[PDB]
């Protein structure tokens, strides 16, 4: 859906003579908290040897974008499952929010790589602070000074079946 970013902090259940287990925190992109907790337990079992029935969720908090009205360049480091193994991938997305950048990446994976949400892992989303560090041409072409471009061949949407005038595509 429309993605939201959460922090999930969990731990093992405290035991006798071994109190205060260490806390672990993950940043999870998900549509709701149920999916976020499911992803957290999945990744915790995949990385550490912690099971959901042996652990507990200490906290889950939504993380809002700090400056949602500022256009930013994002580098997204992801990995996906395959029969050969786990493959890295780096993409660059120009957007005003981390969650919208993640949604764009997921749509791009569904379109090109034929990938799925459960098979795509979001490893890192980092804002590119300097314009010189952007290294994809399809993003660099929008960083040029005094950028202008027209929108030729405009198609207007008619609410009526029949039109009494030949249409124009001017803009």
């Amino acid at each position: 859906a429309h993605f939201k970013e959460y922090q999930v902090i969990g731990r093992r259940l405290p035991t006798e003579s071994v109190p205060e287990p260490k806390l672990f925190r993950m940043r999870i992109f998900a549509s709701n908290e149920v999916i976020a907790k499911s992803r957290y337990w999945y990744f915790l079992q995949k990385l550490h040897k912690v099971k959901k029935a042996s652990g507990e969720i200490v906290s889950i908090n939504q993380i809002n974008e700090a400056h949602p009205t500022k256009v930013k360049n994002f580098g997204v480091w992801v990995r996906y499952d395959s029969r050969s193994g786990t493959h890295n991938m780096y993409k660059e997305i120009r957007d005003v929010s981390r969650v919208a950048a993640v949604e764009t990446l997921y749509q791009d994976m569904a379109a090109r790589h034929r990938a799925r949400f459960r098979s795509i892992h979001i490893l890192k989303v980092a804002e590119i602070e300097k314009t010189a560090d952007v290294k994809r041409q399809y993003v660099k072409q929008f960083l040029t000074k005094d950028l202008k471009f027209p929108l030729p061949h405009r198609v207007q949407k008619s609410t009526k079946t029949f039109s009494y005038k030949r249409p124009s595509t001017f803009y």
């Binding site: 780096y90 980092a126 560090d133 290294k135």
Partner: peptide, 25 residues
């Protein structure tokens, strides 16, 4: 192609240096 590879490497080296002694003492 990631830009902050140096920062990632520095962070993981620091984590290794800490975890070397976190179990010993």
């Amino acid at each position: 192609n990631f830009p902050y590879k140096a920062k990632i490497l520095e962070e993981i080296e620091a984590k290794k240096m800490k975890d070397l002694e976190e179990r010993e003492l």
